[PDB]
């Protein structure tokens, strides 16, 4: 793998450690989350991001950060603010961006 893929795998491992319950591990389905496909146009999750790094589909850290922000944004759009899901989305979005920008 390329030096960029190795960097992105490093960031992904540290970001997924912020979600020990695995809520962002795999794609949401409308069985789990009624109406999700009517609300969310562009789903994202950590498993999809890992497959994209392995396939060498990210040109830059910028494109990788955009998928991580899309994931967190979708969770804050679908889930209400008082839920575990919206609170973790907001927490990890900000912590994960500061981690990747240091």
């Amino acid at each position: 793998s390329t030096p960029i893929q190795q960097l992105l795998e490093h960031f992904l491992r540290q970001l997924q450690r912020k979600d020990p319950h695995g809520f962002f591990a795999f794609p949401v389905t409308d069985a789990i989350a009624p109406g999700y496909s009517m609300i969310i146009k562009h789903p994202m999750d950590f498993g999809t991001m890992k497959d994209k790094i392995v396939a060498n589909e990210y040109k830059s850290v910028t494109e990788f950060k955009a998928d991580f922000k899309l994931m967190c944004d979708n969770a804050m759009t679908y889930n209400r603010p008082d839920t575990v899901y919206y609170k973790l989305a907001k927490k990890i979005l900000h912590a994960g961006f500061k981690m990747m920008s240091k």
Binding site: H21, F23, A31, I32, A33, P34, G35, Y78, N79, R80, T83, V84, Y85
Partner: peptide, 10 residues
Amino acid sequence: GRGKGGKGLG
């Protein structure tokens, strides 16, 4: 019905 099937309190 807006919300996940479990409350994610594992």
